[PDB]
């Protein structure tokens, strides 16, 4: 009768000073603007206006960013209560069925080895075999992926029992065998030393087979690919391939070494025809949802990327600790897991972990209504994806909303999952092929209200906002051992490409409908969640004040004067007060969150460079595209860097020529414009140093633009 | 050492030729920590690598044994396995010797093919004459 | 004899905080004075950096990776430093 999971508020000892420094920030920031308005510069009037505008924008950004993080909380789970209540011994489990979705598009760019490792890790989760299923969707309809899945299914019969018997962590063979940590830490089982050697010697041969398939699948035979049976591969053309569904492992698929069964594995490839838009990942997700409903009809849908593997085998049980609770399960839309990455530098030069976002902002969002949907590692409720309103304590309309397949409509009514008794399993394959056809979503509500929502490259935020607009809430959980681990990019260009994609998606959402501003005025979305959604969608737009603030130094110092007046009564008091409080809230943030100072400093540097490199181009592309229906993404920081460096050097030299007894202006212009270089220091390291990735054309363009700016100064 | 190297080459060379091992030097190839299963299409490669490593370790043991055994000069001079004394007992009065280890009739490797000819050459040195060393 | 944790790390914390705040405030007050006396300022600048340098592993241990500092220790150190600073006046 005790609660399955417990909500632990942050202790007041850390929470109360946080609010005190927040309100102190508000009071001392509403007066800096007044003091800076009452002191205009008569010799640098446009420059003074630019500085005050930038300060106003930065203050507004800080306010709208710190409001959501007012009341953070934490959550704890008790797996023992799950075992005692539902996962009883000597009795079939009452756990609800779960379906795990994996999506891939191209085996050439994404190697099959990581996809095979993800499939193996998913197939070896600590969950009943008959209550879990896996669906792998290939967008490109690749022959190599099909054979890789077949080999993975063959090897799973040997890999799964070993992991289940010896409690191997992680379940992915590649990452488990690559660990240099002592594997003989707590292995009680006697017959473990001998089995590990054989399993390693078998995994190496499995890798050899996968490499052989990859090497053999580098060129297209002129007569098309041919399967082992002899029939030609239907997906010879990646644009004219009819829908195919294949089941590898299941009830009758085969038995492992121990004689038991394995979780069902289904390979789904949708039908693609020329002249029709498929919406890429969103369309694939909708097709996977419909096929899963027709075939197995799982109660919950966990989305896992191809490059993300299960580091903790009890992630599904922890998710069920939240979803299956009667009181907080009828109003929960999804459970979001934190995203962690391995194989990264010790210093994390590219800040790929995103410590601040994933351990500070997410908790604050969870304090009001829950975290925002971010893609991988999310367990969705099936009834929430259908647009049904939450419960808090018609045939024509049904066909118009869902589709024209009576089997899917009937399977919708099953709120607990499972195949309805009326639906005969003899014809569960033809109906699935009927749903996978490309002409199914025509004249339906799919992609608008039901399931994934189209209209954005970062189509995860829109789906979560649409779900939250109906009154649903989401749950954020942090296991002691991370549930999902992925591979982070190791290139500045790739990282900036993904940041540009996210920012462009946010801008595209902002200009279109379904925004938090003009949409969602139903009365069920909490205002603080509206503020969080507004911040996440708008934060592209703060680039222009940022670049103006970072362009200030050289333009100001090449000319005379500054943004600051002479230090007098009440003049420097606000300066020191604001600076001290800005540094004051940071230590409290690190204290309650547990984030190291180095991670926060690195996040600040990335915030600055990404504010320049990706965000103005996101704004520019969105604005131009809306009003009109590479490697250049790295140039504006280069112009700012060169301009600031040359400017400060020439200005200090000119100050030497002047030789005046004015410490104030020189110190002000010296402390400033070193802040910019320090925040652009990873930029300078990336441009000049080892592992250089800078084309000469970028340097030439930056030099030309800087020359125009320097000539403009005169 | 050259004789033992020629003996071990009969096993090392065919493995490198068949599996395209890079680099060809066993020490530096086995000392690399990079993933060796990068592009190895050949199926019978995992089993052969273990045996080849276990054979290279014994070859290193044999070489170390020879080096340890050849730290002092026997008072009667070095004696070959055949029984005849080593002509180069004195490093200054050794007549020229030429020995061929591997070649057309030297022997066949594990695959039955042949190996490149290996010749050991030691020039004749006499006192009172300058040899110019490397030149 | 005359009478028949984690507090063992506090006195260095008080010395560290007291010295740091002291030297900062004193150099700022010297800036306010703006006098041509290099001797005293240099003597008080070279000194009290010797202490921090000899307590540098202490500062690294308190603040940095692998931190093992309870908040109660920080609170006690702040209180003691406050008493010392008020005693100076």
Residue numbers in the entry:
A (entry chain A): 261 to 653, 718 to 953, 979 to 1063
B (entry chain C): 408 to 542
C (entry chain B): 950 to 953, 979 to 1063
What did the published study say regarding this structure?
Cellulose is synthesized by cellulose synthase (CesA), a membrane-integrated processive family-2 glycosyltransferase. The enzyme synthesizes cellulose from UDP-activated glucose (UDP-Glc) and translocates the polymer across the plasma membrane through a channel formed by its own membrane-spanning segment. While bacterial CesAs primarily function as monomeric enzymes, structural analyses of plant CesAs revealed their assembly into triangular-shaped trimeric complexes of three catalytically active subunits. Cryo-EM analyses of all three CesA isoforms reveal the formation of homotrimeric complexes, similar to the secondary cell wall CesAs.
The CSR has been proposed to be intrinsically disordered and only its short N- and C-terminal helical segments are visible in the cryo-EM maps. For GmCesA1, however, at lower contour levels, additional CSR density is evident, extending from corners of the catalytic domains of the GmCesA1 trimer. Viewed from the cytosol, the extra density resembles a hook extending by about 20 Å clockwise and tangentially along the trimer’s corners at the water-lipid interface. At this position, the CSR’s N-terminal conserved cysteine residue(s) postulated to be acylated reside near the membrane interface. The helix has been modeled for GmCesA1 and GmCesA6, while its density is detectable at a similar position but too discontinuous for modeling in the GmCesA3 map. Between the different isoforms, GmCesA1 exhibits greatest product accumulation. In contrast, the activities of GmCesA1 and GmCesA6 peak at pH 8, with a slight decline at pH 9. Quantifying the release of UDP during biosynthesis reactions using a ‘UDP-Glo’ glycosyltransferase assay reveals Michaelis–Menten constants for GmCesA1 and GmCesA3 with respect to UDP-Glc of 0.44 mM and 0.18 mM, respectively. The apparent Vmax value is ~eightfold higher for GmCesA1 compared to GmCesA3. GmCesA1’s apparent IC50 for UDP is about 0.8 mM, whereas this concentration is increased to about 1.3–1.5 mM for GmCesA6 and GmCesA3, respectively.
